[PDB]
Design a protein around this ligand. Structure first.
Ligand SMILES: OC[C@H]1O[C@H](O[C@@H]2[C@H](O)[C@@H](OC[C@H]3O[C@@H](O)[C@@H](O)[C@@H](O)[C@@H]3O)O[C@H](CO[C@H]3O[C@H](CO)[C@@H](O)[C@H](O)[C@@H]3O[C@H]3O[C@H](CO)[C@@H](O)[C@H](O)[C@@H]3O)[C@H]2O)[C@@H](O)[C@@H](O)[C@@H]1O
Ligand code: CA
Ligand code: CA
Ligand code: MN
Ligand code: MN
Lengths: 240, 240
């Protein structure tokens, strides 16, 4: 289909169109991407992702069209630790994408260690909300929590300083305009605090015509819950 | 998801979210539900169906919500003869539905012979555009071409006389309002000729909470092409 749209105001346990990978699962009408014990407390060494089952037609060679899409979502992070890790990411990848081996911790369940910074060995666009930046293990990160736009590499092509707020929902709007090729990100907390970051990228030189969209999160030695609370998505093919 | 929508202005050959059953295939940017030979001519004894891969949340027992849906599509029938058969139908059924054994010809690929008229033995709602009504084989049909609403039976609960026009596209709008429980069908040819039929039905007592939507068509001894040209669908769970 040229246009596809779906909305999850909440996430009831009875799901049919979501592909669950790793430790991801539904709990309390929300998606817990990373594993939690019986009490709902976060544990270390966990990775989880979800993908919408239907494939998205991102662009079309034959007609020279590229999709205009928008993804609105909200999540919250919780951790008794002063350094909760590792972060959550909204991503776009080939339909057959699976959790790479050894992609836990700072790799956010998105990249394999050997090629994490090799933009030539990956096909993925992601918006990360990174909370762990220890310069000795996450050598590619700026030295502070950040929102980053990732294009085939865990080393963000762009980051902006971000404030992690325990237990507070962050509302995010990610949009792509094929005319300008601008990928825009706008995130806000309930008190009006706002973050914005934009990047110009030709998606058809990075991703295949058909893709799947979803979220990924992970925790290595340090941990925190990565709770996806709501999500709506829409995409339509436009001439360019 | 509480809401889902998709639109196929046309049907390019590289499809990812369509389940093809029987002889259904893509040709000339359209979906040919029934088989055709090398030169695009309809053949006898053929059945085919397509369903969208993503499951539709028609109703939710916990929240007491029922979905409002709208399906818009256009199709054309072509036949060298004059009494082309058997018809095309838009339908809603459980997710695992498949072509029943011996559901060819007049059964439109939707019902099994032995239970075609047993309401308590089926789970399907369909809007049929029936062009063949010979009383010896299609004993359940009115004695003229017709559009009908089928609820768990090949014997429509409501029909309206219809005019089959070889090679002309019929634009169809099917809507279901949970508030009134009215399933409305409006079909029109380009010249404005309009046909309408509706019926009150509580989907909760006929179908499971999650379903799949698609089209079915068949030709028995008499034949005609059943060309699905475009299709858009949208559903939203609502509180009545
Ligand atoms: O250096 C000060 C920082 O310490 C803490 O962070 C550490 C640090 O970045 C580094 O330390 C290595 C070793 O240091 C020793 O002194 C001991 O503390 C050892 O226990 C420690 O291993 O690496 C630590 C491990 O990094 C993993 O976890 C982080 C956070 O979750 C991830 O971002 C990394 O990618 C990495 O995960 C990978 O390894 C995991 C197993 O080790 C595995 O489970 C994952 O799948 C993934 O492969 C790190 O904890 C911390 O207190 C900082 O705040 C402080 O600045
Ligand atoms: Ca990091
Ligand atoms: Ca008939
Ligand atoms: Mn980062
Ligand atoms: Mn009939």
């Amino acid at each position: 289909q040229d246009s596809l749209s779906f909305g999850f105001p909440t996430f009831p346990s009875d799901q049919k169109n979501l592909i669950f990978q790793g430790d991801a699962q539904i709990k309390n009408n929300a998606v817990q991407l990373t594993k939690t014990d019986s009490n709902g407390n976060p544990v270390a060494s966990t990775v989880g992702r979800i993908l919408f089952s239907a494939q998205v037609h991102l662009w079309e060679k034959s007609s020279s069209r590229v999709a205009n899409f928008q993804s609105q979502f909200s999540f919250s992070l919780k951790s008794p630790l002063s350094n909760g890790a590792d972060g959550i990411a909204f991503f776009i990848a080939p339909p057959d994408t699976t959790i790479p081996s050894g992609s836990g911790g700072g790799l956010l369940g998105l990249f394999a260690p050997g090629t994490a910074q090799n933009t030539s060995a990956n096909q993925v666009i992601a918006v990360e909300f990174d909370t762990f930046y220890a310069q000795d293990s996450n050598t590619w990160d700026p030295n502070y929590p950040h929102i980053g736009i990732d294009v085939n590499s865990i080393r963000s092509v762009k980051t902006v300083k971000w404030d992690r707020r325990d237990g507070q929902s962050l509302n995010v709007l990610v949009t792509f305009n094929p005319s300008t090729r601008n990928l825009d990100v706008v995130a806000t907390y309930s008190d009006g605090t706002r973050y914005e970051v934009s990047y110009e990228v030709d998606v058809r030189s990075v991703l295949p015509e058909w893709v799947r969209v979803g979220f990924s999160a992970a925790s290595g030695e340090q941990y925190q819950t990565h709770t996806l609370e709501s999500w709506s998505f829409t995409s339509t093919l436009l001439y360019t």
